[PDB]
Amino acid sequence: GSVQIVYKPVDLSKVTSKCGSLGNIHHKPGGGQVEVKSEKLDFKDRVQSKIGSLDNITHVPGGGNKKIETHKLTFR
Amino acid sequence: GSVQIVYKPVDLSKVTSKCGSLGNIHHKPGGGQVEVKSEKLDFKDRVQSKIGSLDNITHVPGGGNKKIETHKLTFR
Amino acid sequence: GSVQIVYKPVDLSKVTSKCGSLGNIHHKPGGGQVEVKSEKLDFKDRVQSKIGSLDNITHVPGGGNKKIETHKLTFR
Amino acid sequence: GSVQIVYKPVDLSKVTSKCGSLGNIHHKPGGGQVEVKSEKLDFKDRVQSKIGSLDNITHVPGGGNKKIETHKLTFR
Amino acid sequence: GSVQIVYKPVDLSKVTSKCGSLGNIHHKPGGGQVEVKSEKLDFKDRVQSKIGSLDNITHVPGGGNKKIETHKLTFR
Amino acid sequence: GSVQIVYKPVDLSKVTSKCGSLGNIHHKPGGGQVEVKSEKLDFKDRVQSKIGSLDNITHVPGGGNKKIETHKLTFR
Secondary structure, three states: OOEEEEEOOEEEEEEEEEEOOEEEEEEOOOOOEEEEEOOEEEEOOOOEEEEOOOOEEEEOOOOOOEEEEEEEEEEO | OOEEEEEOOEEEEEEEEEEOOEEEEEEOOOOOEEEEEOOEEEEOOOOEEEEOOOOEEEEOOOOOOEEEEEEEEEEO | OOEEEEEOOEEEEEEEEEEOOEEEEEEOOOOOEEEEEOOEEEEOOOOEEEEOOOOEEEEOOOOOOEEEEEEEEEEO | OOEEEEEOOEEEEEEEEEEOOEEEEEEOOOOOEEEEEOOEEEEOOOOEEEEOOOOEEEEOOOOOOEEEEEEEEEEO | OOEEEEEOOEEEEEEEEEEOOEEEEEEOOOOOEEEEEOOEEEEOOOOEEEEOOOOEEEEOOOOOOEEEEEEEEEEO | OOEEEEEOOEEEEEEEEEEOOEEEEEEOOOOOEEEEEOOEEEEOOOOEEEEOOOOEEEEOOOOOOEEEEEEEEEEO
């Protein structure tokens, strides 16, 4: 017999920010020391890797807001 | 016999921030020391890895608001 | 028998920012020391890798807002 | 009446070192952070001064032996 | 009356070193951060000064031996 | 009456070194950050000064030995 699916998500959304000022922000790393020692690396599927980083990041977005959605229908 | 699905989420929402100022922020890492020692690194599926990192982050979003949604329907 | 799918997402949504000023942002790394030591690096599928980085980043977008959607339908 | 001084130190001496090896010496400072804040520095006679230094020294003399002597006579 | 001074220091001395090897010496400063802040620096006689230095030294003399002597006679 | 000074230092002395090898010496500074801030620098007599230096030195003399003598006679 008949199968009917009706799928309708309805979305109204706001991810919002109001800021009067971003500033006078200081990031001043005092150096640093790193050592890493290995024999063999063997990365076989979808691997994300960092080895021995000394990474300094300053990230000052006026917004930096995120909205993430997934919508999925599966039929058998 | 007949099968009927009706799938309807409805969303009305706000994820909001109001800020008079973000500021006078100091991040001053005092240096540092790291040592890592290994033999074999077999990573086989979907691995996220950090090894021996000395990573400094200053993250100062004016918003930084997140909204995450999943909508899923499955049928047999 | 008959199969009917109707798939109709409806979205009106905003990932929004208002910022009065971005400024006076200082990123001043005091150098640093990194060493990495290895023999064999076998990377076989979809691998993303960093080895021995000393990376300074300053990222200051006036917005930097993200909206991500995935819409998927599968039938068998 | 008559005054006689005879001033005669006699020195026979050795200040000696014998070493089979100096080596495999590692000095690896982990970075560091210094801040100094001042108004007025009035230095008036024979001052030796260091302010806000972050100085690293590795000093590995094969000898480094010291002999210091003063021989002094005063008459009125 | 008559005054006689005889001043005769006699020195036989050795400041000696024997070394089979100096080596495999590593000095690896991890960077560093210095800040110094002042208004007025009034230095008036014989002043030796360092301000805000980040000075790295590796000093590996095959000898580095010192002999220092002062011989003084004063008459009034 | 008569005044006689006889001033006669006698010295046989050696500041000596024997070294089988100087070598495999590594000096590898990881950079660094310096800031110095001032208004007035009034230096008036015999002043030696360093301000805001970032100085790396490697000094590896085969000898590096010192002998210093001062001989002084004063009459009034």
